Amino acid sequence: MPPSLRKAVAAAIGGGAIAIASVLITGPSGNDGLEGVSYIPYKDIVGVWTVCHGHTGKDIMLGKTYTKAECKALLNKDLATVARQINPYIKVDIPETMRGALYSFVYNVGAGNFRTSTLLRKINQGDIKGACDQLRRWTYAGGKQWKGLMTRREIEREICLWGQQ
Amino acid sequence: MPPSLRKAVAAAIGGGAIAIASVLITGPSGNDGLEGVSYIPYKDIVGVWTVCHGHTGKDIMLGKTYTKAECKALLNKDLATVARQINPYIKVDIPETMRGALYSFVYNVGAGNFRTSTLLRKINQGDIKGACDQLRRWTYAGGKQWKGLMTRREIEREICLWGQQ
């Protein structure tokens, strides 16, 4: 992964899994994360209105320009939700970096998908490393494998393994 | 369908399939259709850089704020590309309204999915009404049905059937 990303993540680690995921998502510069960004709401290709760093919800105001700070609060709020949604499903100790990597993965694929994942099963068997490899299976959409998802999962995979090599 | 769209598509008919498809994608106002719109490029959910009416390609200037006029020009080229991609595969005559609906559909799901569809199979065997119904089967992605695609397919289906009712 880009050296600038490694560095932003390392700076974020003291903030814990939330800060780490936040960095993966926005990138150090706010433009350059794993998630696309727009300060004006837009319809994605499944017809869902999206704003900021991929925030979705019925709170989104159509004719409105969101501030950098409004977007930060939305992300924090959404990542808190991700944490609440998956943490009780994780039943072994894991590094804050892996947890952060998982918030990013789930921010993308959704908590339902996480809860029924083979990945989660591997985690709970104490198979931390193998759970990290499972990220590779999540690179398909619309019946097709996507280079952008492959890259995204390799980066998520790397933070996943940040502790263990 | 919304009456405003009905009027727009009706006005577009003399302009052929491309003008019809343009109405569907950009909407009656040119600023609110089936497909989303952004004037600053952004990375979509499969990590692909996008701008304007969902334009993708090697010609996207990341630091540029695009104008409406620029966005419509790009859509125009992309629609001609969709037509080039699918028209040789359609062996029977179909109304312009139906072909316009198909451009919009293929703009969403891609020419690969179209070329292998049961939808196309039915078209070329003359089952036009059956082709149109097939659209309703294209509302799934990431293992779930999306209300936004269901609404889109219904709009595209109505146009697809414009001729015969």
Query: Between chains, do B42 and A44 touch, taking CB under 8 Å as contact?
Result: no
Resolution (A): 2.0
Whether A162 and A101 have beta carbons less than 8 Å apart is answered as: yes
Instruction: Please confirm, yes or no, whether B96 is among the known catalytic residues.
Output: no
Measured between alpha carbons, how far apart are the two ends of chain B, in Å? 13
Query: Between chains, do A142 and B141 touch, taking CB under 8 Å as contact?
Result: yes
Measured CA angle at A127 (ends A125, A133), to 5 deg: 130
Instruction: Please confirm, yes or no, whether A44 is among the known catalytic residues.
Output: yes
CATH code for the domain in which residue B19 is found = 1.10.530.40
Print the domain residue range for B104. 1-165
Whether B49 and B56 have beta carbons less than 8 Å apart is answered as: yes
For residues B7 and B21, give the distance between their C-alpha atoms in angstroms, rounded to a whole number: 14
- In 3D space, the residue among B53, B50, B44, B1 whose CA is nearest the CA of residue B22 turns out to be B53
Number of domains in chain A: 1
- Residues from chain A that touch B36, judged by Cβ atoms under 8 A, are 42-45
For residues B106 and B81, give the distance between their C-alpha atoms in angstroms, rounded to a whole number: 11
Which of A44, A110, A148 has the CB atom closest to B47's CB atom? A148
Residue A15, C-beta contacts closer than 8 angstroms, at least 6 positions apart: A22
Measured between alpha carbons, how far apart are the two ends of chain A, in Å? 15
> Nearest CA of chain B to the CA of A107: how many Å?
11
Query: How far is residue B109 from each of residues A42, A45, A88, A151, B16, measured CA to CA in Å?
Result: 19, 9, 37, 22, 21
Residue B38, C-beta contacts closer than 8 angstroms, at least 6 positions apart: A38, A40, A42, B50, B51, B52
Whether B43 and B49 have beta carbons less than 8 Å apart is answered as: yes
Question: Tokens 């350059």, residue?
Answer: A32
Whether B114 and B156 have beta carbons less than 8 Å apart is answered as: no
Question: Tokens 């009712």, residue?
Answer: B165
Q: Is A88 helix (H, G, I), strand (E, B) or coil?
A: helix
> How determined?
X-ray
Gyration radius (Cα) of chain A, Å: 15
